[PDB]
């Protein structure tokens, strides 16, 4: 809609103010910030870096709408059957008495 | 007037009533095609494209062509 101006370095709130799924991951819990997805989302919104949430989604949809959708439809592996036709590993080997041609030299 | 969805265009007046009243009409200068000109029937005196060819004659020509189209095979049938 309107033009977007990136926030200044002073306008970005501190990381300690961000909240996770249950509560802020302050000192003694900082390393849990990496694992909490909601905390990362809130931090991105706070820093005005909302694209980190939006860009991966849309692109993914496009990737599904364009390339993977048809790949799954045409070449995907359906559910296996109850009685399974496993490979006996007997096919392919040359028969006894066969004289294979020499390799290049 | 209209003929189905085709409406006859009408020229907008350009003269005011005062100026218009001072105009002297002399139909002797008009072409013979347009004398006693009527906006509701401007082509009443217009010449025919082909002398003696009426609109009903053309309509009947089409009707006869349709009858031929539907009845020729009844008189000269052909095998598959």
């Amino acid at each position: 809609g309107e033009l977007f101006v990136r926030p200044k370095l002073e306008e970005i709130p501190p990381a300690d103010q961000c909240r996770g799924f249950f509560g802020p991951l302050n000192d003694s819990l900082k390393f849990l910030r990496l694992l909490d997805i909601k905390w990362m989302m809130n931090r991105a919104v706070a820093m005005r870096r909302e694209y980190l949430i939006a860009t991966p989604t849309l692109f993914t949809f496009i990737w599904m709408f364009t390339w993977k959708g048809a790949v799954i439809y045409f070449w995907g592996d359906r559910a296996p059957p109850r009685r399974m036709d496993w490979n006996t590993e007997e096919t392919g080997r040359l028969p006894l008495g066969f004289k294979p041609t020499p390799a290049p030299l | 007037y209209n003929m189905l969805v085709f409406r006859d265009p009408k020229r907008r007046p350009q003269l005011s009533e005062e100026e218009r009243a001072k105009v002297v009409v002399n139909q002797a200068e008009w072409p013979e095609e347009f004398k006693d000109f009527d906006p509701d029937d401007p082509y009443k005196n217009s010449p025919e494209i082909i002398k003696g060819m009426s609109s009903w004659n053309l309509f009947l020509w089409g009707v006869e062509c349709a009858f031929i189209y539907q009845f020729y095979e009844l008189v000269f049938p052909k095998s598959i």
Partner: protein, 168 residues
């Protein structure tokens, strides 16, 4: 030497006659897939390194400067270390076509060379195979033509329940 032109016919034939694909040939193809992924990874790493090296000083300062998304403390230390390492010495920082060439040509050359020599490796592997696929590869390199229906000509092994067709 151009191995791809020889190998395309062989790959198409194998797809058409994949029933006779032994587990050894399957392992060969899986190794080819793994090496393709490895080549992609190393080429991407080289491309990223070249991009980082040729990046502008202001660009690096913005990228590896404040603020910190997580602000754990290790993040800031790592960013400062990388920024100091890059900005300490002088770096050739081209723009436009020049950066395109510098970042891309080495990557393309590396990827293409690795893939080509892995294709040669796969050709050698199939040459050394003692299966019908290996025999087809050897015949292809000898006569220059793919001999279809070879597995049923030389009577390649079949499951015990499907040997009736060979009964002649």
């Amino acid at each position: 030497t151009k191995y791809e032109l020889k190998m395309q016919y062989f790959d198409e034939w194998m797809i058409r006659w994949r029933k006779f694909q032994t587990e050894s040939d399957w392992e060969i193809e899986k190794g080819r897939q793994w090496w393709r992924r490895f080549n992609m990874a190393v080429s991407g790493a080289l491309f990223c390194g070249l991009v980082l090296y040729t990046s502008g000083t202001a660009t690096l300062k913005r990228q590896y400067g404040l603020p910190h998304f997580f602000d754990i403390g290790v993040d800031g230390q790592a960013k400062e270390t990388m920024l100091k390492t890059l900005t300490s010495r002088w770096r050739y920082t081209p723009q436009g076509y020049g950066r395109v060439l510098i970042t891309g040509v080495p990557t393309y050359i590396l990827f293409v060379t690795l893939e080509h020599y892995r294709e040669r490796r796969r050709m050698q592997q199939y040459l050394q195979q003692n299966t019908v696929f290996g025999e087809q590869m050897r015949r292809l390199l000898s006569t220059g033509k793919i001999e279809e229906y070879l597995p049923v000509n030389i009577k390649a092994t079949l499951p015990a329940s499907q040997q009736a067709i060979y009964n002649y």
